[PDB]
Amino acid sequence: SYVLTQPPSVSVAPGKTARITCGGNNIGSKSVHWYQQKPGQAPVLVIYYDSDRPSGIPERFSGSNSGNTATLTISGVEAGDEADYYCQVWDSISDHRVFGGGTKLTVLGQPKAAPSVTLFPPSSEELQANKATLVCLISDFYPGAVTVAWKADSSPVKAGVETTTPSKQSNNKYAASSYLSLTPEQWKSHRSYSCQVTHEGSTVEKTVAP
Amino acid sequence: TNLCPFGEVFNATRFASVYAWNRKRISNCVADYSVLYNSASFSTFKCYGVSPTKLNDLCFTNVYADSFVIRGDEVRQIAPGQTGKIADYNYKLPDDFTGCVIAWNSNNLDSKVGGNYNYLYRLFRKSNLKPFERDISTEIYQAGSTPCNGVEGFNCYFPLQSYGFQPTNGVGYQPYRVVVLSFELLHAPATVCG
Amino acid sequence: VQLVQSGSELKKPGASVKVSCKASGYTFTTYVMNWVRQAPGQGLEWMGWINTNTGNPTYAQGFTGRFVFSLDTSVSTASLQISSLKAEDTAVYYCSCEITTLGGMDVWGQGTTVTVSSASTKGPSVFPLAPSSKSTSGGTAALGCLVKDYFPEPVTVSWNSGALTSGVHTFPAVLQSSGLYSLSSVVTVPSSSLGTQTYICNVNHKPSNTKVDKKVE
Ligand SMILES: *[C@@H]1O[C@H](CO)[C@@H](O)[C@H](O)[C@H]1NC(C)=O
User: Fold this and answer.
1) Do the Cβ atoms of A13 and A78 come closer than 8 Å?
2) Is-cis flag, bond preceding A122, omega within 30?
3) CA 20 to 30 Å from A125, out of A78, A97, A165, B91?
4) How many domains is chain B built from?
5) How far apart are the C-alpha atoms of B28 and A190, rounded to whole Å?
6) Residues B84 and B51 grouped into a single domain
7) How far is the CA of B35 from the centre of ligand 1 (A)?
8) Which of residues 86-105 of C touch B (CB under 8 A)?
9) Chains with ≥3 CB–CB distances under 8 Å to C
10) CB–CB of C103/A34 below 8 Å?
């Protein structure tokens, strides 16, 4: 069926205008509608008919639709406007309505902070159980976009990597944990393992050894 | 040089209630208006402030295709300077309206034998609508000095009623699909021509 | 106008589930009912609609074969039944009403979460994250516990029976590819107090009744 293309993440400063695009094959011919879903809540309609505003939405929200991209533009971006944004079209003949992929709007309303990394080697108790879990804890970072890479000596490994999605802490910064599940014979056949956290173009590597 | 999506408004499978009318915004396309009026599928195709045949040779900054459903009796009210429950409380055209009103009977598509109550109009409101005002508020209408507080009863009624469309209704009591094409001006650059 | 849906469901693969959507405030049969699906980490995906008048359901491509929109006009309630559940069916399901394609999807239920995991109830293992010179930074030392392999959520963790909350971080768990959960819980203290002061992490998994107190050397 029909296809709708949203940017997955958009970064805007507090107070400024954020612009989210909604691509589609000749979408200015149809009616687009925009929704705003805060985490854990049901979606809420902010703009229907390309541009028309429901009662209760602040005047800051205004839409656009022409050519092949609709454009949701938020005027005075506020701290509370961080949420996912989806664009939906209804097809006149198909009577199907189609949603987009979503867009996570992030307000740059907090200074950049680097992550604090703590790396634990496997416990001797877990090795007696014939298992091994390297534990890499990340934390106190903003924005909540980090990427983790595990290496054996100098050999990257993705086999056995399970990572959280970044989740905020009690202090408006984020926290994440990473688990590399290994065997005792792998853990001991290398000189060292390295957990490596990349955030905003900067890296913090911790290394442990048998 | 893309063609306008007039087919998407006129040939849309489900239309809107008249109190909650649509505004498809038309922009950046070519429109063959003469294809629409020679269709001879409309019981009403009455413009104002412009000629239907001279329309092909013209341009506008924005074209607004408003579309809703009413009865045939009320089609007369989709005009400038009309009174009546539709003209006053649902959809009002300005006395300086400069577009076209198009209507055709929809009793085949928009009527169920047991009765189709999907379509609605606004029967109670404290004052007339401003031109191109859309009122979707479902607030209990207060008729007495005593307020309602969202509880129906005497002097406190739901502002909206339902059209009763049956295939055996009188032709005037039958559903008519309306499309209203509002045309603006230049000064600002144009995007819709023929 | 109100839409209220059923509570959270848990099922094994191949089971069945039926989600309800009681309405109130308007005439149930006046307005179409719509179902939308949102899987973890994805976006809203339209499922289809059932005409609350004729009963005719429309299933978009991708939800045909195993889903059943039904109604119960008597209680003003629509229902969603899923047969032969799959792991990929795990999502939050919403019932939403279109007034028209105008205010289309203008009222939504609070959502019903549906999890399809072949996992059975299980209690966790607690492995010590001991302090050494790899966890010592200046005058602080980091240690903790690894609450490995447990199902289902949640698990409460505390230190020294609550007498140690300063410097504590309990992290969000991971659902591992096995379908079992695994979190860690840590605290930093002065490395001056590693030998004298003792550290025990409290582990409570109430769905399985596992209470385990673990010292860390
Ligand atoms: C509606 O569909 C018919 C059948 O294809 C077509 O002849 C007519 O031109 C269409 N109307 C518009 C406004 O495109």
Assistant:
1) no
2) no
3) A165
4) 2
5) 65
6) yes
7) 10
8) 99-103
9) A, B
10) no
CA angle (C75, C81, C85) in 5-degree steps? 155
Domain that holds residue B95: 3-114+167-183
Q: Which helix (H) or strand (E) holds A199?
A: strand A193-199
CB count in 10 Å sphere of residue A118: 23
Specify if B126 maps to a domain.
Answer: yes
Query: Do residues B108 and B137 both lie within one domain?
Result: no
Give yes or no for a contact between B57 and B194, defined as CB atoms under 8 angstroms apart: yes
Q: Which of B2, B13, B29 is the closest to A95 by Cβ?
A: B13
Strands C168-170 and C174-175: unpaired
Contact: C103, A54; criterion CB under 8 Å: yes
| CB proximity list for A63: less than 8 A, separation 6 or greater | A32, A34, A47, A50, A51, A52, A70, A71, A72, A73
B37 and B9 in one domain?
A: yes
* Virtual torsion, Cα C92, C93, C99, C102, nearest 10 deg: 50
CB contact under 8 A, C146 and A45: no
Which of B8, B63, B139 to substitute to test the interface with A, most A CBs within 10 Å? B8
Q: Which two tokens stand for residue A152?
A: 């054996």
* Residues B106, B27 within the same domain: yes
Q: State how far the Cα of B58 lies from the Cα of B70, in Å rounded to an integer.
A: 30
Q: CB of C179 within 8 A of CB of C117?
A: yes
Residue B59 CB neighbour total at 10 angstroms: 14
Say what the resolution is, in angstroms.
Answer: 4.0
Which residues, in sequence order, are CB contacts of B91 under 8 Å at separation 6+?
A: B18, B19, B21, B66, B68, B78, B129, B180
Q: Measured from the CA of B35, which atom of ligand 1 is nearest? A: 9
Cα B7 to ligand 1 centroid, rounded to whole Å:
6
Q: Distance, CA A166 to ligand 1 centroid (Å)?
A: 52
User: Which experimental method was this entry solved with?
Assistant: X-ray
Residues C93 and C38: their CA atoms lie apart, in Å, by 7
Closest CA to A117 of A151, A141, A133: A141
Work out the minimum CA distance from C16 to partner chain A, whole angstroms: 24
State the residue for tokens 């969202």.
B150
Contact at 8 Å (CB) between C33 and C52?
yes
* Pair (B145, B77) in one structural domain: no
> How far B17 CA sits from the closest chain C CA (Å)?
8
Residue C138 neighbours by CB distance under 10 Å: 7
C-alpha to C-alpha distances, C125 to A129, A132, A182, C203, nearest whole angstrom: 10, 12, 16, 10
One domain for residues B110 and B120:
no
